[PDB]
Design an enzyme around this catalytic site. Structure first.
Site, PDB file in Angstrom:
ATOM      1  N   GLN A   1       0.834  -1.183   0.000  1.00  0.00           N
ATOM      2  CA  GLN A   1       0.000   0.000   0.000  1.00  0.00           C
ATOM      3  C   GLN A   1       0.877   1.243   0.000  1.00  0.00           C
ATOM      4  O   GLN A   1       1.864   1.321   0.739  1.00  0.00           O
ATOM      5  CB  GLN A   1      -0.938   0.009   1.204  1.00  0.00           C
ATOM      6  CG  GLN A   1      -1.848  -1.182   1.272  1.00  0.00           C
ATOM      7  CD  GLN A   1      -3.241  -0.825   1.723  1.00  0.00           C
ATOM      8  OE1 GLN A   1      -3.513   0.312   2.091  1.00  0.00           O
ATOM      9  NE2 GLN A   1      -4.131  -1.793   1.692  1.00  0.00           N
ATOM     10  N   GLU A   2       0.499   2.209  -0.846  1.00  0.00           N
ATOM     11  CA  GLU A   2       1.233   3.462  -1.053  1.00  0.00           C
ATOM     12  C   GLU A   2       2.691   3.205  -1.439  1.00  0.00           C
ATOM     13  O   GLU A   2       3.627   3.578  -0.726  1.00  0.00           O
ATOM     14  CB  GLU A   2       1.142   4.376   0.165  1.00  0.00           C
ATOM     15  CG  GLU A   2      -0.250   4.785   0.549  1.00  0.00           C
ATOM     16  CD  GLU A   2      -0.735   5.980  -0.225  1.00  0.00           C
ATOM     17  OE1 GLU A   2       0.111   6.792  -0.642  1.00  0.00           O
ATOM     18  OE2 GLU A   2      -1.956   6.137  -0.391  1.00  0.00           O
ATOM     19  N   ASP A   3       2.860   2.505  -2.560  1.00  0.00           N
ATOM     20  CA  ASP A   3       4.062   2.395  -3.384  1.00  0.00           C
ATOM     21  C   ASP A   3       5.214   1.638  -2.743  1.00  0.00           C
ATOM     22  O   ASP A   3       6.255   1.494  -3.378  1.00  0.00           O
ATOM     23  CB  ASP A   3       4.589   3.762  -3.827  1.00  0.00           C
ATOM     24  CG  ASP A   3       3.489   4.719  -4.221  1.00  0.00           C
ATOM     25  OD1 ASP A   3       3.645   5.934  -3.973  1.00  0.00           O
ATOM     26  OD2 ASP A   3       2.450   4.260  -4.727  1.00  0.00           O
ATOM     27  N   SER A   4       5.076   1.150  -1.520  1.00  0.00           N
ATOM     28  CA  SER A   4       6.209   0.492  -0.897  1.00  0.00           C
ATOM     29  C   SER A   4       6.397  -0.906  -1.475  1.00  0.00           C
ATOM     30  O   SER A   4       5.447  -1.567  -1.881  1.00  0.00           O
ATOM     31  CB  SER A   4       6.018   0.417   0.605  1.00  0.00           C
ATOM     32  OG  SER A   4       7.151  -0.171   1.194  1.00  0.00           O
ATOM     33  N   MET A   5       7.643  -1.370  -1.505  1.00  0.00           N
ATOM     34  CA  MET A   5       7.949  -2.610  -2.201  1.00  0.00           C
ATOM     35  C   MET A   5       8.422  -3.670  -1.218  1.00  0.00           C
ATOM     36  O   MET A   5       8.908  -3.363  -0.129  1.00  0.00           O
ATOM     37  CB  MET A   5       8.993  -2.399  -3.292  1.00  0.00           C
ATOM     38  CG  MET A   5      10.161  -1.548  -2.886  1.00  0.00           C
ATOM     39  SD  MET A   5      11.210  -1.177  -4.292  1.00  0.00           S
ATOM     40  CE  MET A   5       9.970  -0.756  -5.513  1.00  0.00           C
TER      41      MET A   5
END
Ligand SMILES: [Mg+2]
Ligand SMILES: [Zn+2]
Ligand SMILES: [Zn+2]
Lengths: 1415, 87, 131, 107
Positions: free
Chosen positions: C2-6
């Site tokens: 969620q929200e671009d974290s990898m």
RNA sequence: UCUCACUGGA
């Protein structure tokens, strides 16, 4: 703090008093005999020069002699020196006041120049306001400049009332830095003004002089305004710095003092010995200049005294002016202890009030809790484990403030904890702390969450609290503040935790919701296709942390147990819910499953999307919080999060280029659609080549072409985007994310598929940085869109380099706007905070400042909280007359307005009774007077309005609780319904004083809500549609009373600071007929300054006729400014020497026409055919206007209009006439009006709407004409007949106040500010801007939001000083010696007490008797 | 002077509590509780002084007096008990 | 995510993915006054005072360039009298720790016995790191 | 009532502070051609008597100084003839509460 | 022992 506890009585501050020293007072205070300019280390040894630092002043560590005040470096305030100033010097900032007070006095006596002999001096001495009183006396005493001995009083001129004599003349002194030249002025008598002379004059100025000059002879002495003994600060103010040995690096103020004392020796040795009367004048000016450049070094004596090695100066005005300055850096928020800062990371497995702290912070963040018998075993076990683990202890603070430092000694498992000690345990779980991210912008910018210690050092948060923090997972950083006392923990835990914050005061909506991944997952999940097996229902039902252990009945059991997963979502949603939306055609048989219906945690139908589970107005989270409370809301988030988490982990959702590529023939349709768009732009370019373009008014032909090109281009763009979006099928994942609302938009899919569109720079399309072309790959003078900035293909096919350069411009523009708007919105934020910092709401529900000045009588006119206010609809304000009468009208003595006995069990016996009929016609006439009242209040008549607790929700809640079966008639008594209406109408206590002022205030305040309540709980409503019981009615009224008196505003909210932040948030989201908005509009309105860059206004037509075009043309012509430059090409002076026949053959007939006394100077003016058709101007009107505007020396002569040249011959009517006549004909050309008033620029004839009530009952969106214009002169455009001047509107609030009174100016300010903020699309509540607009218009004018106004008001000094005006306003309040009441927030921030507001806005006292009682 | 105490009639403030008053009462009773005071109600085996204070204020059992500062500098007094903690 | 974290395969991080060395270098100076007074790099003692352990020093206060360094070790031994022996060593970095790598013992144009230390430190891609 | 057509001399205004209590007004014909209270942003203004001022300041624990103000040269104040020290009630329409009272001193 | 300068991140 404070070892060796002592016997001084302890208190808090109430007085802040300023004023200036006596030199004799400094001699009383100080213990100094200062003469040694050599500073310290006598003969370079570690010892004490007794001239400077330590003549028993402050010393440093390990050498303690400080006149027995030893105490180490700590625990000893330093003490002050003094200076024996032989020649008296000025005080530098006070010099402006010194000039302004030496304009009032006859010299060498001290008497006031102008006394109560003057009537204006008499009347101006009645001002009991010191600063403005001295200003008015300075304005009066700049008038006459000679001491008048015999003065005529205000009785008669011939007698001469005397006073003190000595009629000397006051010289006109103009300032030159440190020099004030006294030039007595016949006989220019420039004299250097002696400091000793003006010393003696101020020593002779007297008691009534000071006090009538607004100054205090107790404290504020303008003869103390002159420095002749300067105290010296201690080394505990100016420290020393070593290079491991005192070789280099002492302090700058120490060397300033050594410098001024050296200059003091320079003035000393020439007065102790021989006197050079033209070179001892510089023996002072060195000392004067150095002691003056000490306290201030921005003087008009522009030699900076730049000190050695390139570093100029270190002075005190530079020390005190803020922003790394002293006040703003160390006094209003500083660097703290008990601090933690790292990177963040996400997880959904945690919960909404949880944050994942690293274990090694937990080994170093700690908490000093007292020794408690309640967990003495666990605390002694923590100090037995030791400081070198997680569950350990750091210090054992003993009983008298003594820290046991554990690990460095040899007994880490030492002494049992004695009662009264404090064990400094480390962080454990469920101590919720403060957790903020810079920039801080609103109430929600800080929150509190419980601790769940983890490895892998990040800070967690739940993924739906990362939305109102406005953080993201790009490594953006957040801080951690751990509260310290027990009551501090209580305060933070009971207020600042997230579920208490959930409903947002910003625009009365929820600020949280469900965000991207969880959101799209719940969007795919609540589709009807999501059929689930058995054990996965088992797994998710364990995954819910508060399952009831009930395996639900499978909705499909035909052979096989299946589930339409909306149902297994419904086990997450707790009980007592309803919602209903009815989107477009959702009437209970939805062919789309869009909409909703919930009962108690059973989704009946509908998808779950952002307008249910996100941040929405009819938010399901909103309804959950209102119907239950914060902890049930907090568990709602956990349920929906982990349920959709597991379903996403074992279904999956991906996306890719397959979501980007459209189908083949439709991409072909897209490209031919843009081809027909270029066909349209090609036709209008080839129509521009023929120049036949009808330019409508407002713009020329070129920009009238430009708006058509841009409009046709973007219209084609969005039409092709709709073609793409309805091409795509359900398996388009990015389309699924669009209907989710997680990211993106229809514009985003349109950009990625159909066409990129149109680049831009600064509003325009691409203009030629070169000449004629944007790029050398283009032709010169191209108005094709391909050079003007159209881009042809979407991101799929690519970028030709011209398009790539256009797009690089279109993006670098956006980086420009962020890299300037962060600065200016940050300044506008800090200005609005420091403006409205202290406005709270006090116990009688009235709104006050720091100084008790009343600002709003009821906050928001009702005392209704932005933490509560919802949006409900009206029902009365619409409806036809016959339909509304059929709706609410009840009578038994008629045909159709009877009731049915299927509602009322006693419906038979009720018939015909006048003893109830009078009550029914009372209620119906009450609501019809209400209907007239609503259409008096709201002119348009929209129905959703910000009101408190939802009637409609509460009656439907009683329905879904008490099981209304709609077949049995009800037992409800109609007299009881009317009586309950009346009793609860008299029950809504917001104001609690028993006299007529308070009762009129309460009724006038809650008038509209009571109107709403009776419109809803009317008879035919509660019978016919809500169908209640006796128990249902009584529980409904109990609930309305209960939650209304719960949702009344409490006292103590800093509504000013919360209002400032809530208007300061949505200014950040802003970007950039051509009328402006945005941060320039906000700065132009708050900085109210006159040079506004678009002062527009609007008029309406005559109230008689509706939309008559000829008459609107008449009004715009009669207002439209018309000068002679607008009508002329050729202004010609000829010399036709025959003033009875024209030597030019064009004008033979005209003189003998005119004669049906002059000059030989033919004065010829041409009019053009364009202008006299631009205005409905007659040649005879124009000639008679020239006649009646000159009337002195000119013979007016027209021409023919039907002949196509329009010539104004003139001569002169009684040779050196042209030398002045050229300036005369300039003054004709550009200085004579012809129509309207000035500042009537571009006038736009618009046909707006008119949302009016009908003449038959309903509403009507009506057509009329409304003009638009971009000037301002309100008094003169107002008085013109033919308009609707009761409904005129301008933005120019200065002229609006000065034309229509201060309260209408306030209201127009409000409509202006609200509409230009909400033009962006964002929303804010009414009341925050209401408080702001009232503090603007409270002091009487329009106080600008800057240092020109409210920070120049009469309020407290130390509250006023912390907006970068430190030296000015500090010396001001020292000059006038003010008493600051310490009734201010920033004041208690500075002085270190509890702030006298909110949870500091009362006392807490122990009772003696109930202590005895409760045992 | 102390010429500024209204008697218990015509009290224009509320018979409710506020969140802020609630916060200070809870914290102050918690400060006594964690500072080794005699408790008034039985422990539910509870060493959690916020929860202890909430248990006490469930039934109006906390011995304190509130001083609501009237908006001119005068004040009223208030028993903790006559309030209504409805919220 | 969620929200671009990898999200990261830790096993490949064991296998070498984004593994990295890191090279910081230091300085130390036997200082120079104006009156030709030279200072000294030698093993310091108690004869501004620290309390760091001398456990990894050299003959002349140095550290041998192939040893693991940790905690608050004294980095470069330095002494200077005035005509006493000060605690002019510099202790370790509070923010980093690793291995001393390379020591050269040099001078300047005017003869200040100048010794240096480069540090090597392995660093593995941990969770709170930005990619 | 004294109404000029276009001008009154500023030195003629040095005759104005002359006698208590009869006061001479000064008005433009042109400015008074339309009403400056008929405008729909202007809220209705209503006077107060001094005993009711005592009533108000005893009800709200207030004085002369703590009040929201106005300047004497205010246009509708000169429409009403307001002198130094008075209190004027203002009853304005709104949105979230229907009606609300407003009080302005005349300093 | 820190003052200032200039980079760096949001
Ligand atoms: Mg960021
Ligand atoms: Zn001392
Ligand atoms: Zn005199």
């Amino acid at each position: 703090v404070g070892q060796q506890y002592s016997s001084a009585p302890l208190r808090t501050v109430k007085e802040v008093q300023f004023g200036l020293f006596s030199p004799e007072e400094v001699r009383a205070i100080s213990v100094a005999k200062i003469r040694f300019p050599e500073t310290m280390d006598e003969t370079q040894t570690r010892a004490k020069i007794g001239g400077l630092n330590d003549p028993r002043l402050g010393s440093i560590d390990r050498n303690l002699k400080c006149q027995t005040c030893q105490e180490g470096m700590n625990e000893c305030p330093g003490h002050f020196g003094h200076i024996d100033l032989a020649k008296p010097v000025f005080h530098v900032g006070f010099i402006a006041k010194i000039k302004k007070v030496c304009e009032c006095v006859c010299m060498h006596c001290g008497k006031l120049l102008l006394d109560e002999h003057n009537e204006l001096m008499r009347q101006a001495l009645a001002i009991k306001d010191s600063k403005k009183r001295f200003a008015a006396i300075w304005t009066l005493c700049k008038t006459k400049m000679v001491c008048e001995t015999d003065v005529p009083s205000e009785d008669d001129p011939t007698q001469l009332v005397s006073r003190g004599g000595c009629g000397n003349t006051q010289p006109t002194i103009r300032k030159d830095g440190l020099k004030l030249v006294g030039s007595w002025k016949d006989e220019p008598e420039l004299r250097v003004l002696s400091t000793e002379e003006i010393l003696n004059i101020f020593k002779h100025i007297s008691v009534k002089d000071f006090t009538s000059l607004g100054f205090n002879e107790v404290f504020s002495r303008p003869e103390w305004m002159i420095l002749t003994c300067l105290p010296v600060p201690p080394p505990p103010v100016r420290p020393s710095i070593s290079f491991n040995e005192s070789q280099r690096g002492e302090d700058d103020l120490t060397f300033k003092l050594a410098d001024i004392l050296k200059a003091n020796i320079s003035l000393e040795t020439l007065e102790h010995n021989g006197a050079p009367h033209h070179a001892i004048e510089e023996a002072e000016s060195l000392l004067q200049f150095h002691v003056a450049t000490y306290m201030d070094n921005d003087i008009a004596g522009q030699p900076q005294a730049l000190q050695k090695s390139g570093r100029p100066v270190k002075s005190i005005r530079a020390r005190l002016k803020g922003k790394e300055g002293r006040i703003r850096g160390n006094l209003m928020g500083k660097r703290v202890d008990f601090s933690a800062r790292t990177v963040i990371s996400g997880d959904p497995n945690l919960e909404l009030d949880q944050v994942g702290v690293p274990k090694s912070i937990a080994k170093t963040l700690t908490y000093p809790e007292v020794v408690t018998p309640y967990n003495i075993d666990r605390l002694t076990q923590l100090v037995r484990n030791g400081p070198n683990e997680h569950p350990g202890a750091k210090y054992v603070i003993r009983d008298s403030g003594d820290r046991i430092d554990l690990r460095y000694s040899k007994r880490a498992g030492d002494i049992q904890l004695q009662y009264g000690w404090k064990v400094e345990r480390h962080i454990m779980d469920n101590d919720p702390v403060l957790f903020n991210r810079q920039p801080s912008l609103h109430k929600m910018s800080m929150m509190a969450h419980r601790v769940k210690v983890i490895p892998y050092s990040t800070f967690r948060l739940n993924l739906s609290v990362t939305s109102p923090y406005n953080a993201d997972f790009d490594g953006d950083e957040m801080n951690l503040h751990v509260p310290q006392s027990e009551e501090t923990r209580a305060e933070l835990s009971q207020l600042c935790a997230v579920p208490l914050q959930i409903v947002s005061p910003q625009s009365n909506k929820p600020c949280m919701g469900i965000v991207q991944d969880t959101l799209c997952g719940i969007r795919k999940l609540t589709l009807r296709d999501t059929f689930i097996e058995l054990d996965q229902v088992l797994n998710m039902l364990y995954w819910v942390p508060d399952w009831d252990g009930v395996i639900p009945t499978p909705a499909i059991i035909k052979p096989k147990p299946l589930w339409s997963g909306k149902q297994i979502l419904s086990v997450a949603i707790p009980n007592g819910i309803h919602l209903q939306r009815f989107d477009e055609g959702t009437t209970l048989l939805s062919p789309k499953d869009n909409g909703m219906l919930i009962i108690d945690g059973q989704i009946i139908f509908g998808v779950v999307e952002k307008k249910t589970v996100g941040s929405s107005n009819g938010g399901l989270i909103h309804v959950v919080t209102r119907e239950k409370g914060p902890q049930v809301c907090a568990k709602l988030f956990g349920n929906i999060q982990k349920v959709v988490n597991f379903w996403l982990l074992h279904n999956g959702f991906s996306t890719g280029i397959g979501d980007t590529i459209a189908d083949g023939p439709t991409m072909r349709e897209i490209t031919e659609t843009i081809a027909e768009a270029k066909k349209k732009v090609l036709d209008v370019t080839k129509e521009a080549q023929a120049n036949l373009l009808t330019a409508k008014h407002g713009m020329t032909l070129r920009e009238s072409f430009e708006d058509n090109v841009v409009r046709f281009l973007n219209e084609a763009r969005d039409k092709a985007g709709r073609l793409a979006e309805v091409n795509l099928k359900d398996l388009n994942n990015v389309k699924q994310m669009v209907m989710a609302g997680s990211k993106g938009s229809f514009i985003n899919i349109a950009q990625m598929s159909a066409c990129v569109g149109q680049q831009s720079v600064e509003g325009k399309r691409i203009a030629f940085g070169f000449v004629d072309r944007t790029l050398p790959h283009f032709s010169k003078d191209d108005y094709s869109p391909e050079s003007k900035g159209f881009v042809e293909n979407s991101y799929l096919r690519g970028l030709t380099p011209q398009e790539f350069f256009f797009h690089a411009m279109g993006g670098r523009e956006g980086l420009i706007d962020t890299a300037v708007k962060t600065a200016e919105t940050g300044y506008i934020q800090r200005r609005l905070v420091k403006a409205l910092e202290d406005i709270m709401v006090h116990y009688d529900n009235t709104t006050r400042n720091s100084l008790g000045n009343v600002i709003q009588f009821i906050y928001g006119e009702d005392g209704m909280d932005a933490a509560h206010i919802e949006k409900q609809s009206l029902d009365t304000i619409g409806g036809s007359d016959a339909a509304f009468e059929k709706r609410y009208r009840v009578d038994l003595l008629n045909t159709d307005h009877t009731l049915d006995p299927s509602l009322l069990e006693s419906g038979s016996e009720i018939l015909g009774d006048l003893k109830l009929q009078v009550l029914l016609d009372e209620e119906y006439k009450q609501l019809v007077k209400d209907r007239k009242f609503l259409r008096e209040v709201f002119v348009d008549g929209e129905a959703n309005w910000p009101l408190p607790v939802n009637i409609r929700r509460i009656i439907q809640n009683a329905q879904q609780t008490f099981h209304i079966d709609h077949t049995k008639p009800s037992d409800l008594t109609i007299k009881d319904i009317v009586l309950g209406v009346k009793d609860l109408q008299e029950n809504l206590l917001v104001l609690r004083g028993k006299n007529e002022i308070i009762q009129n205030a309460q009724r006038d305040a809650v008038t509209l809500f009571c109107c709403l309540l009776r419109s809803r709980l009317a008879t035919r409503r509660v019978l016919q549609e809500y169908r209640l019981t006796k128990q249902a009615f009584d529980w409904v009224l109990s609930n309305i009373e209960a939650q209304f008196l719960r949702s009344v505003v409490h006292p103590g909210e800093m509504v000013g600071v919360l209002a400032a932040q809530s208007i300061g948030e949505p200014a950040t989201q802003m970007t950039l007929k051509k009328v402006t908005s945005g941060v320039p509009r906000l700065k132009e309105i708050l900085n109210v300054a006159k040079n506004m860059k678009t002062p527009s206004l609007t008029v309406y037509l005559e109230p008689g006729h509706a939309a008559d075009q000829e008459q609107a043309k008449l009004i715009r012509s009669a207002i439209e400014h018309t000068t002679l430059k607008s009508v002329t090409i050729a202004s010609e002076i000829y010399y036709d020497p025959d003033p009875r026949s024209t030597v030019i053959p064009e004008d033979e007939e005209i003189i003998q026409l005119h004669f049906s006394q002059q000059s030989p100077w033919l004065l010829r003016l041409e009019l053009d055919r364009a202008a006299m058709n631009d205005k409905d101007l007659t040649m005879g009107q124009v000639g008679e206007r020239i006649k009646q505007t000159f009337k002195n020396d000119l013979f007016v002569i027209w021409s023919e209009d039907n002949d196509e040249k329009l010539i104004i011959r003139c001569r002169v009517v009684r040779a050196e006439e042209d030398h002045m006549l050229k300036k005369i004909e300039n003054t004709m050309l550009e200085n004579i009006t012809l129509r309207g008033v000035e500042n009537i620029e571009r006038v736009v004839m618009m046909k707006y709407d008119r949302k009016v009530p009908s003449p038959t009952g309903e509403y009507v969106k009506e057509p009329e004409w409304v003009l638009e214009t971009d000037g301002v002169n309100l008094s003169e455009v107002m008085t013109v007949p033919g308009i609707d001047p009761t409904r005129i509107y301008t933005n120019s609030f200065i002229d609006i106040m000065e034309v229509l009174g201060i309260e209408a100016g306030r209201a127009a300010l409000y409509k202006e500010v609200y509409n230009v903020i909400a033009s962006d699309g964002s929303y804010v509540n009414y009341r925050h801007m209401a408080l702001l607009v009232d503090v603007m218009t409270t002091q009487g004018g329009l106080t600008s939001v800057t240092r020109h106004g409210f920070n120049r008001s009469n309020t407290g000094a130390l509250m006023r000083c912390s907006f970068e005006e430190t030296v000015e306003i500090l010396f001001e309040a020292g000059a006038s010696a003010e008493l600051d009441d310490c009734r201010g927030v920033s004041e208690n921030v500075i002085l270190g007490q509890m702030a006298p507001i909110g949870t500091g806005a009362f006392d807490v006292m122990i009772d003696e008797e109930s202590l005895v009682k409760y045992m | 002077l102390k010429e500024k105490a209204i008697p218990k009639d015509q009290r224009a403030t509320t018979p409710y509590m506020t969140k802020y008053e609630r916060a200070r009462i809870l914290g102050t009773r918690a400060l006594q509780i964690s500072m080794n005071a005699p408790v008034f109600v039985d422990l539910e085996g509870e060493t959690d002084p916020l929860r202890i204070a909430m248990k006490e204020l469930a039934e109006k059992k906390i011995p304190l007096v509130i001083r609501r500062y009237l908006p001119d500098g005068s004040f009223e007094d208030w028993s903790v008990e006559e309030l209504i903690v409805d919220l | 995510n969620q929200e671009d974290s990898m999200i990261m395969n830790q096993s490949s991080i064991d296998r070498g993915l984004f593994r990295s060395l890191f090279f910081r270098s230091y300085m130390d100076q036997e200082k120079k006054y104006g009156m030709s007074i030279t200072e000294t790099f030698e093993k310091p003692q108690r004869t501004r005072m620290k309390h760091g352990t001398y456990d990894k020093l050299d003959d002349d206060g140095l550290i041998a360039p192939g040893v693991r360094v940790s905690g608050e070790d004294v980095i470069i031994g330095k002494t200077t009298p005035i005509s006493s022996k000060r605690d002019a060593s510099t202790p370790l970095r509070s923010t980093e720790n690793g291995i001393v790598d390379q020591v050269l013992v040099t001078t300047n144009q005017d003869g200040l016995k100048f010794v240096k230390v480069r540090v090597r430190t392995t660093k593995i891609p941990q969770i709170g790191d930005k990619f | 009532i004294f109404v000029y057509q276009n001008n009154i001399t500023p030195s003629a205004m040095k005759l104005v502070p002359s006698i208590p209590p009869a006061t001479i007004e000064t008005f433009n014909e042109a400015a008074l051609v339309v009403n400056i209270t008929h405008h729909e942003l202007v809220p209705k203004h209503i006077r107060l008597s001094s005993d009711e001022k005592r009533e108000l300041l005893k009800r709200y624990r207030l004085k002369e100084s703590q009040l929201p103000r106005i300047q004497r040269a205010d246009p509708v104040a000169l429409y009403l003839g307001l002198k130094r020290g008075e209190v004027v009630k203002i009853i304005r329409k709104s949105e979230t509460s229907g009606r609300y009272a407003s009080y302005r001193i005349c300093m």
